[PDB]
């Protein structure tokens, strides 16, 4: 790989520089290189990886949605061709993330937090593939996303408090999956409300290191429930 000759510690350092420069493609490449050194990631490093790839795929998703809207309103091959170009790049990034998860990061060992974190990522990037998939392949990608979200939920419900930001973010995203991907708005609503209510009931479990993240995601759950009711 292009990062193979660089020290792991220098890759992490350069990922943090790229974050500060808002150079998220660079940041993702540096963190992919660090992952490939084969050592487990710390919590901080985990979240350098995730923010980098989320920003890359987030921009591709926003571009795809713009072109897709132009395309469906148009009903010359140019809009379809360019939408397909962006779609191919987006699928490539998702396949890169999913391969790193399967090949290096997901394991039968580590924090409960660690396994939930990467399993949530797997559900998310299968969801992004599902947003652009068609026909025979869509409903298979859906099943893959569901099984990763569900394994993550099973672990988080047993090993993490109901205010844990990863547990909350997982449920927020799984709830969106139900609504936008699986056409089950009632499962989406039930999960968001249950997650919010169980966080309130055990609000005493907020952690002084992460309570701002917890309460932020609790509002996002309320936001989606407002949007959906």
């Amino acid at each position: 790989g292009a990062m193979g000759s660089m020290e792991r510690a220098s890759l992490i350092q350069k990922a943090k520089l790229a974050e500060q420069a808002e150079r998220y493609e660079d940041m993702a490449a540096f963190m992919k290189g660090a992952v490939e050194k084969g050592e487990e990631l710390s919590c901080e490093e985990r979240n350098l990886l995730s923010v980098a790839y989320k920003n890359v795929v987030g921009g591709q998703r926003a571009a795809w949605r713009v072109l897709s809207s132009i395309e469906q309103k148009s009903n010359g091959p140019e809009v379809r061709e360019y939408r397909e170009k962006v779609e191919t790049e987006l699928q490539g990034v998702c396949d890169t993330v999913l391969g790193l998860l399967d090949s290096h990061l997901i394991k039968e060992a580590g924090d409960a937090e660690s396994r939930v974190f990467y399993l949530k990522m797997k559900g998310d990037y299968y969801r992004y593939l599902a947003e652009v998939a068609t026909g025979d392949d869509k409903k298979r990608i859906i099943d893959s996303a569901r099984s990763a979200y569900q394994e993550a939920m099973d672990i988080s419900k047993k090993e993490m408090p109901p205010t844990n930001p990863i547990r909350l973010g997982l449920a927020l995203n799984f709830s969106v999956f139900h609504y936008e991907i699986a056409n089950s708005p009632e499962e989406a609503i039930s999960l968001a409300k249950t997650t919010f209510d169980e966080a309130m009931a055990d609000l005493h479990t907020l952690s002084e290191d992460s309570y701002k993240d917890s309460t932020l995601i609790m509002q996002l759950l309320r936001d989606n429930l407002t949007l959906w009711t």
Binding site: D124, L172, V176, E180
Partner: peptide, 5 residues
């Protein structure tokens, strides 16, 4: 769109 993190 709905919120995700």
């Amino acid at each position: 769109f709905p919120a995700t993190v």
